[PDB]
Amino acid sequence: NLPHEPEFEQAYKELASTLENSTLFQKNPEYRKALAVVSVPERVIQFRVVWEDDAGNVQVNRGFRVQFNSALGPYKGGLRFHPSVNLSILKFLGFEQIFKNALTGLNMGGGKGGSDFDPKGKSDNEIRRFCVSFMTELCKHIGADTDVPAGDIGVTGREVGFLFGQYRKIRNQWEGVLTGKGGSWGGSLIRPEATGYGVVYYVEHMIAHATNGQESFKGKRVAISGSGNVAQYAALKVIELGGSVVSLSDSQGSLIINGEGSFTPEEIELIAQTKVERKQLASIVGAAPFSDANKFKYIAGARPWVHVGKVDVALPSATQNEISGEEAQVLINAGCKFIAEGSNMGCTQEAIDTFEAHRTANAGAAAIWYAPGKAANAGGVAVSGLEMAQNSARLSWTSEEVDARLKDIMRDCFKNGLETAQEYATPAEGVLPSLVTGSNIAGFTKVAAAMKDQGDWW
Amino acid sequence: NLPHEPEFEQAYKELASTLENSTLFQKNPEYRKALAVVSVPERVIQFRVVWEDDAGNVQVNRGFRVQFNSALGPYKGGLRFHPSVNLSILKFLGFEQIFKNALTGLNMGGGKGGSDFDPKGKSDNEIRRFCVSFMTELCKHIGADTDVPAGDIGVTGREVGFLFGQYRKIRNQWEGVLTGKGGSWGGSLIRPEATGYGVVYYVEHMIAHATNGQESFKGKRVAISGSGNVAQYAALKVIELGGSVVSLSDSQGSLIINGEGSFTPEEIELIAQTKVERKQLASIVGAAPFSDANKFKYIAGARPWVHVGKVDVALPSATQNEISGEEAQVLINAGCKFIAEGSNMGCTQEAIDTFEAHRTANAGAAAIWYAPGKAANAGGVAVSGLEMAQNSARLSWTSEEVDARLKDIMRDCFKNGLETAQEYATPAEGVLPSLVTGSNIAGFTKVAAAMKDQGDWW
Amino acid sequence: NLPHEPEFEQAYKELASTLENSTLFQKNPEYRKALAVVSVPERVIQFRVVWEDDAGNVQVNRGFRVQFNSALGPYKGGLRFHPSVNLSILKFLGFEQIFKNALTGLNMGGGKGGSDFDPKGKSDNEIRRFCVSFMTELCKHIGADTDVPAGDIGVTGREVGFLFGQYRKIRNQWEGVLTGKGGSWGGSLIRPEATGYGVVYYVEHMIAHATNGQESFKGKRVAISGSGNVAQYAALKVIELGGSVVSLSDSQGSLIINGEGSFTPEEIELIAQTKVERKQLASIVGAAPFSDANKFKYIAGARPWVHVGKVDVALPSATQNEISGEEAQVLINAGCKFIAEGSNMGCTQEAIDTFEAHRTANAGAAAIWYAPGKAANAGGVAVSGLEMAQNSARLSWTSEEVDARLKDIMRDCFKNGLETAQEYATPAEGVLPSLVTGSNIAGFTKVAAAMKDQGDWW
């Protein structure tokens, strides 16, 4: 009797739904067995972490590690430190990590770990104590050749340093077990920029194919939610390309541009360091230059999808399930045509159904196009794998080298989903193929073939 | 954001309530932190098990291992192979295992493992294949000095043999990691009968203290549910002592004696061998001697609590939460005075509340007395620990030697709960002390002191 | 080029000189190579221990572990947490542990560990933090079947509990790796008093052999130094036998008796918790019952050898090198006839030479007798080995059984030194044989034969 895990259940149900409504099972009826095997995590570990705060009291926290599948390669996935982390969130993060790694083409598997520890409001000494205890508990199941952690929301370079400091005092090995570290001791360039660069390149390819390369981000208005590294760097890149960003959002409030205009790189940097100290967006809106009413408007507790009016590109990049069914209809009426997920699984099921129905009912560029999270978000993991290869080679790659492949990775990732959709889910004339269906089918076929060749199922 | 685990949540809430409604926290205000720490399992493992059935198809099952606490000693707990096994059930089994081991006074920690594999309807080859695949993955964390598996519902000597075969094939060590094995290769005598003998002895001590040793099982009618080894041997012991057993139960139906009388030892063996092949009780009621309508009445789908009439002792020993509030009221009206839990958490929370209220509202033997599951069910774990000691000594202990110790264990376990209840939860004059409160307080104080001396909390 | 290690160098020089001034090397000229090999520890480990105090500051300490020899069995020796602990002290402690274990006759090797951490003045949280940090580093080499530490000066049950907690958190094994633990979880009865009982029995045997059984502790005056467990329990036992203790001492001052009399069990008993909470003796003399000037005289900073006047037995039991030549002459003049070392290597080299010369120059009971520290101090290790055997058997021995055995060990230890001294160092008529020579030769011959049979030297 399985427990209730809404996020993972919804993700798996969506994957099974887009697999069923195609010709995959008609051509390969034996692949239905692989779905049952691939949906059960290979190994899930939960451990109690007991640490001491500055006041000398005992604290209790839970640590998790989910290793979902390793058919393609060793385990990979960063540590997410957030108060909402439970088994379900890490499970679906690993589940989509599998296919995100499969689509990129790099030979490396998917997993995830983390905890419910909340860095916000915690002094340096307290997080040092927590990291020491956490790595003491976790050290029994880690290693660069068995699981590859990295950075994520809630974990910065300081926690990574403390984790590695405790790890070296038990196993006494120096290797690239963790990625996203400091550049001087195993990091890679463009890594903070890579996720946003990848999503922007993917949506650019989408636009080019949809309109036969007639327009681009120049002369367009893009809607962005969230203020994380991915959203901020995608906004910076689209500004550099020639686009106009119209809104940035945060969990408790959203800041929206007023009238026509776009954000400038200088104040975006100020937003960047604001989240570095994990502060509030409204804590800055009361001072210059965000005290200006004509350019910046702060609306606490409201998402930027309906207050923004006319837009062309939507990149929900803040949390999961951040677009409801009602928001989807409003986005259609606002003139939006292309949506990509900055963060994994950012749109609810009803919104996906609405976008798919609109795509099916309209031909040509008049139909809105959907980019699934496991496709456009794959840049960061690709560059992380390249960083792992570099640390294996013990060499440093320049900014231009790794920025060239990221362009190539996305063009291959887009084609792989598009071509597969045409053959397995061939649509009627004049309607663009389903990118979500193609991406899911491509990733699942790759993983299923690998598992079959390794004898996991038969 | 914790998931919904109804069984463990109910057990933890019950323990916390019975601790709060006493003077433990007034004398020792610092023990709240110990309660916070002790409620989180030390380590939980979930792994995918893939095995091949007789038809050559892929099968998928989940394996669990919950290691709850080791302050008192190394981990201990059998493997439960039932189709309903999930994380919550194993978690609450381990949680009560900790205190059950604490009350007996032996040095052993609390843990549990199992799977959702269903032995019923499975051939020998299929179950052997599953056992091989299961021990292949579990072997990465096991060992006699780290965790002690045993027997439980759903596991027999055959599964134990297959598990041991794969263990010795992988790690190549021979030691008593599993208890309850065959007597010739590490088992101990009286092991099947120990649980029933212990619960019956505890009830006997309960009667002696309540009525000043004026009556005993002889001349009384006892109500028993379930047909497991614990209930079967408990009924046999009541027959030997001189009581009357009136009912046996199964998951889908119950069989109840008609009028005055009691079961005979010869027919009890017929029920005993029937469950050996995991066959249904109704499959034997249609033939002699159970085809007699004058002695045996089969009521499928109904519990024997309200169809039995006048009773004196209730020993619910089939599943968890098998007595509701209405059932408790019917037992109160029927004249029953003494209840003990054959299985863990036999009665639902409302039933405990009703029994406690009736005990508080009445004085003397007119008040119904409640025996908690963690107290009267401790015989099996005690003899298992003695078996571990014997295997350490590489010697065999005779039937009479281990039967005397179990008599001494139960009288000490009963006294420990009774004396502690008087000092911490002293009632009004003429009212029997709360056995559940005393047992919970004794076990919790022992475990909390053991953890404090080891620095788990401070 | 060896460093300067005065204590170990002095002990090794004493052993070498004692062996040379006898016929061991004449009979077995090949044993010089064994003396060369045995003087080098098998393995010495030093590690930095970094721990955080209550104020949040960084603290640095050193951890040591010396495993001197293991020809007779696995390593054995407690952890000593004292400020003066450096490599030399632990080296000579392990060196004498070798032969102390050899004389007793049990099959267990010699070793020692500890640190320069200072428990005095430290709160419980600081001790827990240090113990966690210490057992994190030491865990890489420790185990019940490789090295078995115990209790010593500076370590009590609390540090044992914390160390065991961290050890079971890292290695996850429960076994009798540490001796001297709590009785409920691996301890043994009559363990704390065994050292004092053993030294008292040994000196009693010496007296009986010296005066042909015409005298005992009844009617004698015994001088004792120090206030440790050994000194306190030796005083208790000799009081029970019929002796009179006249002085206790401490590192900052000594308390001698005034005129004729002796301390009573109650005042000795209250001294125990005085040292348990680790407060200076002078903080107690100013109050009752030690405020009485008629019975107690506190001479701070002075040893009790000179101010005590006439004595019959001296048991220096405080620190190493606690008796110089002048004190030896004063003890000779005061009428003492038997010297036994409560602690390891209590008498300096010149004092030992003086006692030996006095023994050689006089015949019969007129010559005073010297007992080496490695002989009379062997009770504690013997009962600790018995405790190890009990934990192996997972059984507890009663107080009476361990008291009879401890009396049997001492009579064997005395004879072993006595008989060997006559064979190899036969003196002139009427002169008592050299106990130090006999004990050293017996221990060395046993260890050398064990090493030769194992191919360490050839």
Place this chain on the structure above:
Amino acid sequence: NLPHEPEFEQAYKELASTLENSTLFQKNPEYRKALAVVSVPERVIQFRVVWEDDAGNVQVNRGFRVQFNSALGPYKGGLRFHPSVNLSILKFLGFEQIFKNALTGLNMGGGKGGSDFDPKGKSDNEIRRFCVSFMTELCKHIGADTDVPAGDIGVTGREVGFLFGQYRKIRNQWEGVLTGKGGSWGGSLIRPEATGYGVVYYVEHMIAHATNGQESFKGKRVAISGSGNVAQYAALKVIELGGSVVSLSDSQGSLIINGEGSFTPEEIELIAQTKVERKQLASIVGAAPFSDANKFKYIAGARPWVHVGKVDVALPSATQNEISGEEAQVLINAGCKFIAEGSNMGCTQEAIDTFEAHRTANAGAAAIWYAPGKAANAGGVAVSGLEMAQNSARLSWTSEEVDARLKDIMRDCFKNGLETAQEYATPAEGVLPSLVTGSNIAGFTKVAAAMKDQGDWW
């Protein structure tokens, strides 16, 4: 109570005094805590090695390994087989190894091991047997990803071959655990000449900066002590560059050129062959071409500092503390202006003070400049790290490639010390900055930042 370790105490006192007399602690008062932590080795291991010589007699030697600090990476340091090796020498070698690795910029830490075994006068069978026993004892802690040994004084390729032969039999792994091996099985080119090339390049940069590039090694006289690989190759390189070498030295005596002239490469080459067989320099002065009294003068037991007359460059490269205060003044009077240490801590404390005072009291090139050993002798470890990277890449690098990099490291290492001294220890106008102060501050700041980011101290 720390023991007397003169060499390590001298080095630590030098570093502490150098840091104190600057503004490092004024800008960062918190770094005083890091000094206490960094001065205690992480782990020190000593073991007894027993081996059989050619005559069948038992031989005993002591083995050591010191792993000082690993904040920057895994441990590194060769095995030194010299009869004078004890704990203090290896400790200070590792201590300066940490900072020598920090200044170079390669990311790998410091450590050291060795023994007191004396290869001189030992047949090949005896050293094979000793290496077999030594690597059997040391195998419990060694590994390429844990500690990286290399070559040093007393260790040639033959001992390395024997050690690797025994190590592969136990652990059974082939990787770059040892550096300085044969070029066909993991060695690197230029490796023997690397340290000499590095020191000569550093001093050439020093001369260029002091004289504004107006002077170089052409037309200068350089005084060199020692006849090891470093001194021999430095003399060869300066001869090729256009310099004039005037003296070589050995342990018991020194050979000094007579009048004006310089050594020729053919003579320098055969001295290396002389030291290959560990033969004596005086054994060669008695024959041609050293039988010529006009060019060569052998002065046994005398150092070449005061017998040489006018010199320009002094490169003491024989032992530690080979220049005392008296010879320090003579070097000033002889016209020397630049001193660089070939070996670690070539000059004593008084000589360092004299050079520093003379530098402070004079402006311009008239003041003598002192190059610390931890800066100029960094070439060998840099090329060893490059060799480790090559073995990781499993590729062979040409002679010219690695020779170009070694020129780059010295130019970077010089500015790093020079620039840091300018900012933290800014001198008066016209006074050259203190290279020793700058190098110490740079290395210590890098190591302290690494430790802080790793959470060793806080």
